[PDB]
Design a protein around this nucleic acid. Structure first.
Ligand code: ZN
Ligand code: ZN
Ligand code: ZN
Lengths: 66, 44, 48, 1131
RNA sequence: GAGGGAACCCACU
């Protein structure tokens, strides 16, 4: 829904990388090159950003009750 | 007490046996306030 | 049927009351017997 | 230019993307409901006869034109409002639209002209509206408008809101109407039987079934008889032909046998002619028919009228019901007898019940039309009674007071709410489960439930044939998605590109056939039938054609360019049997196929290029249908087509195995349904494992819908961090699994580690779980309302007081606010009050009827909503949120049928690790693989390792030669890993290398709904049932477990008699009775005064105390109620 | 320190 703070397997910080990863993908990087530029070497950290579904953006399209 | 209207986002005072209607927009679905009691979450 | 035999009544109405009493007693004992309508609650469900 | 094989995969998924951009996935529900609303309601109102009423004054009531509004709500004030679907869900309203009608009342007096009253737009009830249909308020809205209305744009619609509950109409299979099916009844008096469930088209009426059967050999010869509707006995077929108006044997045999040079048909029709020789006139045959009717009239002319009514109105309504349409009926009955003789000769194969072109699918349209037909008949009946009453004693009646709108409104509401498809007073004799509560645990479960088919054959049936996966289910029904248990094979699911036909009028096709050289049946001699082709339109034999090949070419050309024949019309040429059958009716399941002409696709690169810019060119799937490139083929037509599996079957050399391909599959992986399309590499798995994954993908927790914060569902499940799979299928791009995923890509090592993953168990990483791996939220909603059940009784939401309320449950009430409702954000436990409701007792003026939280379900109040119900009382709904951290005993499944509970959780320092420090998130046992042969699990793990290293989403479309295990192995070896996915793992406890090398990599896992905390249950002592005084049912009522009969047998075989007595007597229901020592009947015992008296014996001293189960006392008293004397003798 | 039954549907082993 939102990017996890830690990689589930190892605990590397990936919560500060989702917007940087989206900006790299917008800058015509491939997904592998964007993951390599962010220092995600292990494939456990790469599945964090590769397989993330950012559902919070679509949740923010609803008017808040509070 | 204070209920938020579902549509118009405004807070309204409702007494007991008063029909639940928003005095601004007449919307019948209203929600309670978040409590003021002190709730502790472990960050786990 | 106590009323219909304590005062005078016809033979056919007495026989019909006997038939209804027999049906009610039988459906008290057995409500799944074939050949007769099932005793049903007013909601439409049959009785147990 | 032709599409090259290197571009073919991209082109075919382009055209599939175009199909799912136009149609979507719930098109069959929406199309059937739109046809029902636009066409079927008005047709039902028309076909209802006008009401003629005489005492005298004559009143003619005629219902003319319906009007349907948009779904509006009327509160107790009475001001209409546009009622939104979330308002209907939250306030427990029925999302229904008012249905008005135009009525004309004409008055016919004696010595007076006709008087017209135009009651325009008369309200006659409320039609429940399918969501996102034409008459829904969400129709035509953009995604931004849906989000502003707190609706999910990914929500498909296709369901109703009845009392706030989402109800889906499961499609119902039935035998096809108006078609002759010849079977061989086994162990019966009939050798063969022809059957035609005849139903008149363009109308909603019950189907009349006629059985043209032949008697068995075991009888001088075997004879043909006819079982007619509303006729008690079987009638010989020659008598039926004579009563139709053909007395000579020559005319009857001309109607039956089309080639008189065929002697064996003559030999088999000889016994029927010999049997029915004694009747030689039409009136004598009608007398013979009427002698065997439902009630045989004493007057012969009454029997003639009854027989004529049966033969015209009730015998084969589809070929003709009007007067003087008996020659078409005679030709059709002769065709039935001819088909029976063909089956008898072995010259034609027997029909197959399980053949799925002989089946139709009643969707929401036909089912709601059947309901509305019955209820409009009921409404006209009640209007007739009311107006009859006020013309009998009175003179005039008000029409607005005559109509009871409760009939239509509450009948539709009841049948959609309960699923019992019929009337409220006849629920036992009506089909149940037609309407079901829509599954909202996953988006995949919602889609699967919205595309669900049902065979209405009883699940207690132990015959295998309806449950078998028939050959004719290819591309129509998913071969993997079926339930397990009693409903296997009977409950089916749609394939992704399967579309159920909605129905069309036969009139354009009939007119075109009339002036395209087809000669009618009325204008031909029978001698022309032998060499010509019979033409059936919706099962009605309408004529014959002399040149059937150019006729079928012309008809296909018309359908391919979307001329006179519409796309969903099925046209079948039985070439060997010389028949052309045209079907326009609803319920035919079809699928689009690419058209092949002379071993070449009609789909060229220009179509693919136009479809690449779908939102620029305005080129769509419908333009591709209109181009004559694709066409919809149903199951009956598919039995005459020649399918190329791929275009590689077309571009084949000297022996192509076929040079006459007529169609090509768009993609074979489209034979799967919604739930089977998320399986990666399904053709590398055993088929029962694909079935098990199709079952468990509906139990997987993800994000079931986007607007889940607005909704208060009774059960809701939201994963924290759902991930799209690293290894996907292309069919998953249209199930919206990329936008609402259910699961997490997990580093899975398949290894035996500490023995805690044995027998379908997994070891989870506790450190991963601490970081949010598979953490979920459980939402539970509690509804309560004040209700005025009588003038004195008044339930009210109040904060109760101990010295004022009667019979509290000894709980705390301080967490309630002074409105009687708990506040959001407050922690709650199993013994806590969340809604404080008191009911006035007619010093304790009121007693406690507060709503309690379900036991052991600790959590936090997420939301509290207060509103008004339909009848204007205060209505509260409280959503309580509880965070479910993964636990030992929680169920987890991969996408390959590899279910299993968590056996243990190890921390990161205890789990085995690779040389890079990667520990598995989940360890599964190797022994889960070999007997299962879920090789697609291993290939998904390998492909996911490649995908996570490469930075791409792996493609696991089933039938794909571009993806191979060797290619994935070489790609993995290109990234510094062993090519087979093995890694050198080190023991977490000791640091030593594991001697074997462990298969490890990313695999998509799903957290299933079955947590252990929703299942753990213990009882020491507690609530008992009122009647038998035994413990209750289920953990929700603090009930006991059943020590059943099989357990009793096991403890008999153990020899443990005292344990058997403990379980079956004094851990369930101890009881003490007092019985007479003389008669054995239960005595009357006053234990306080020590008065042990037995009536019926005058016995006050020979009484004994007997310890028995309370159920045995209840049994003995029930037997005494049945005038049986169970006498317990202590000697 | 514990006040409904029934029917149907889904699911689990
Ligand atoms: Zn990592
Ligand atoms: Zn408001
Ligand atoms: Zn006695």
């Amino acid at each position: 829904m939102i990017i996890p703070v830690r990689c589930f397997t190892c605990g590397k910080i990936v919560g500060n990388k989702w917007e940087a990863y989206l900006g790299l993908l917008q800058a015509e990087y491939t997904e592998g090159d964007a993951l390599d530029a962010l220092g995600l070497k292990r494939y456990c950290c790469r599945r964090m950003l590769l397989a993330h579904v950012d559902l919070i953006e679509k949740l923010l399209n609803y008017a808040p009750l509070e | 007490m204070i209920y938020i209207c579902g549509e118009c986002h405004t807070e309204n005072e409702i007494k007991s046996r008063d029909p639940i209607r928003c005095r601004e927009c007449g919307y019948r679905i209203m929600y309670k306030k978040r409590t003021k009691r002190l709730v502790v979450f472990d960050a786990r | 049927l106590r009323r219909n035999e304590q005062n005078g009544a016809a033979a056919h109405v007495i026989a019909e009351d006997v038939k209804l009493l027999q049906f009610h007693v039988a459906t008290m004992v057995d409500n799944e017997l074939p050949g007769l309508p099932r005793a049903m609650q007013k909601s439409g469900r049959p009785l147990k | 230019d032709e599409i090259t094989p290197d571009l073919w995969q991209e082109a075919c998924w382009i055209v599939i993307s175009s199909y799912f951009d136009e149609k979507g996935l719930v098109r069959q529900q929406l199309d059937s409901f739109d046809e029902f609303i636009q066409m079927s309601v008005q047709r039902i109102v028309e076909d209802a006869p006008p009401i003629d009423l005489q005492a005298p004054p004559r009143y003619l009531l005629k219902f003319e034109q319906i009007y349907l509004s948009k779904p509006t709500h009327w509160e107790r004030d009475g001001a209409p409002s546009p009622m939104m679907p979330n308002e209907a869900r939250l306030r427990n309203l029925t999302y229904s639209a008012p249905l008005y009608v135009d009525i004309t009342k004409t008055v016919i007096k004696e010595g007076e002209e006709q008087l017209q009253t135009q009651h325009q737009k008369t309200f006659i009830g409320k039609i429940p509206i399918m969501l996102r249909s034409t008459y829904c308020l969400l129709n035509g809205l953009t995604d931004r408008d849906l989000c502003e209305l707190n609706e999910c744009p990914l929500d498909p619609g296709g369901y109703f809101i009845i009392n706030g509950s989402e109800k889906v109409l499961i499609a119902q299979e039935k035998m096809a109407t108006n078609t002759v099916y010849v079977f061989a009844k086994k162990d019966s008096k009939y050798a063969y039987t022809g059957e035609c469930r005849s139903c008149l088209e363009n109308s909603s009426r019950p189907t009349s079934t006629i059985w043209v059967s032949m008697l068995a050999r075991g009888a001088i010869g075997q004879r043909i008889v006819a079982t007619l509707p509303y006729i008690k006995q079987e009638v010989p077929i020659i008598i039926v032909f004579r009563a139709l108006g053909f007395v000579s044997d020559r005319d009857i045999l001309e109607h039956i046998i089309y080639d008189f040079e065929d002697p064996e048909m003559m030999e088999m029709v000889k016994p029927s002619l010999d049997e029915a020789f004694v009747i030689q006139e039409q009136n004598v045959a009608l007398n013979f028919i009427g002698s065997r009717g439902a009630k045989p009239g004493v007057t012969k002319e009454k029997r003639i009228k009854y027989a004529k009514e049966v033969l015209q109105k009730e015998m084969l309504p589809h070929v003709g019901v009007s007067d003087f349409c008996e020659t078409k009926k005679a030709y059709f009955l002769g065709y039935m007898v001819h088909r029976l003789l063909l089956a008898a000769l072995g010259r034609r194969e027997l029909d197959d019940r399980d053949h799925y072109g002989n089946k139709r699918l009643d969707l929401a349209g036909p089912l709601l039309a059947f309901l509305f037909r019955g209820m409009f008949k009921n409404l006209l009946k009640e209007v007739r009674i009311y107006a009859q009453k006020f013309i009998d004693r009175g003179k005039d009646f008000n029409l607005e007071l005559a109509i009871k709108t409760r009939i239509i409104s509450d009948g539709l509401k009841y049948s959609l709410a309960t699923g019992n498809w019929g009337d409220q007073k006849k629920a036992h004799q009506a089909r149940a489960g037609v309407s079901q509560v829509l599954n909202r645990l996953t988006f995949a479960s919602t889609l699967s439930h919205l595309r669900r088919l049902n065979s209405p054959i009883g699940r207690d049936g132990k015959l295998a044939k309806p449950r078998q996966l028939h050959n004719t289910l290819w591309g129509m029904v998913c071969p993997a998605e079926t339930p397990e248990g009693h409903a296997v094979g009977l409950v089916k699911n749609l394939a992704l590109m399967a579309y159920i036909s909605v129905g069309s009028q036969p009139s354009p096709i009939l007119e075109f056939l009339e002036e395209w050289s087809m000669e009618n049946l009325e204008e031909i001699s029978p001698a022309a039938i032998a060499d010509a082709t019979k033409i059936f339109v919706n099962g009605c034999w309408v004529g014959i054609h002399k040149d059937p090949e150019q006729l079928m070419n012309t008809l296909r050309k018309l359908r391919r360019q979307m001329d006179i024949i519409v796309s969903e019309v099925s046209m079948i040429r039985d070439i060997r049997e010389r028949e052309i059958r045209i079907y326009t009716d609803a319920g035919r399941i079809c699928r689009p196929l690419l058209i092949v002409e002379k071993q070449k696709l009609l789909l060229k690169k220009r179509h693919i290029d136009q479809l690449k810019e779908r939102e620029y060119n305005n080129y769509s799937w419908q333009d591709l249908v209109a181009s004559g490139v694709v066409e919809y083929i149903d199951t009956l037509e598919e039995e005459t087509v020649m399918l190329a599996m791929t275009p590689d079957d077309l571009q084949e050399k000297e022996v192509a195995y076929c040079s006459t391909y007529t169609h090509c599959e768009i993609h074979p992986s489209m034979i799967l349904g919604v739930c089977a399309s998320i399986i990666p590499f399904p053709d590398h798995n055993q088929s029962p494992r694909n079935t098990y994954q199709s079952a468990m993908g509906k139990q997987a927790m993800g994000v079931y819908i986007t607007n889940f914060h607005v909704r208060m569902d009774t059960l809701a499940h939201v994963l924290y961090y759902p991930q799209k799979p690293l290894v996907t299928t292309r069919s998953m791009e249209y199930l919206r699994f990329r936008e609402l995923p259910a699961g997490i890509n997990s580093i899975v090592a398949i290894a035996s580690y500490t023995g805690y993953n044995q027998e379908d168990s997994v070891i989870m990483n506790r450190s991963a779980v601490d970081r949010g791996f598979f953490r979920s939220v459980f939402y539970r909603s509690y509804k309560e309302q004040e209700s005025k059940k009588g003038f004195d009784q008044e339930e009210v939401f109040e904060k109760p007081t101990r010295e004022t309320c009667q019979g509290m449950r000894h709980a705390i009430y301080d967490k309630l606010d002074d409105d009687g409702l708990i506040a959001p954000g407050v922690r709650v436990s199993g013994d806590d009050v969340i809604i404080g409701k008191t009911v006035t007792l007619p010093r304790y003026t009121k007693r406690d009827c507060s709503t309690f939280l379900r036991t052991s379900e600790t959590g936090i109040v997420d939301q509290v909503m207060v509103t008004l119900n339909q009848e204007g009382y205060k209505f509260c709904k409280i959503r309580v949120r509880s965070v479910r951290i993964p636990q030992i005993g929680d169920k987890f499944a991969s996408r390959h049928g590899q279910k299993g509970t968590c056996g243990i959780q190890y921390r990161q320092e205890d789990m085995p690790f690779t040389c890079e420090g990667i520990t598995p998130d989940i360890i599964i046992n190797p022994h889960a693989i070999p007997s299962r042969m879920t090789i697609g699990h291993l290939i998904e793990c390998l492909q996911g390792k490649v995908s996570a290293n490469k930075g791409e989403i792996g493609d696991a479309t089933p039938f794909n030669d571009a993806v191979n295990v060797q290619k994935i192995s070489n790609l993995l070896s290109d990234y510094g890993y062993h090519l087979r996915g093995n890694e050198v793992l080190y023991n977490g406890f000791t640091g030593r290398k594991i001697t074997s090398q462990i298969f490890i990599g990313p695999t998509y896992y799903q957290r299933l709904k079955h947590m252990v905390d929703d299942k753990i249950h213990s009882r020491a002592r507690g609530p008992i049932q009122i009647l038998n005084r035994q413990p209750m049912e289920g953990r929700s009522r603090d009930g006991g477990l059943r020590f059943g009969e099989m357990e009793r047998d096991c403890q008999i075989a153990h020899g443990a008699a005292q344990f058997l007595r403990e379980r079956l007597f004094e851990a369930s229901d101890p009881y003490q009775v007092h019985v007479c020592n003389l008669c054995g009947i239960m005595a009357i015992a006053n234990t306080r005064t020590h008065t042990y008296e037995c009536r019926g014996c005058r016995n006050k001293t020979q009484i004994s105390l007997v310890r028995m189960p309370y159920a045995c006392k209840l049994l003995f008293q029930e037997l005494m109620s049945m005038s049986i004397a169970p006498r317990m003798m202590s000697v």
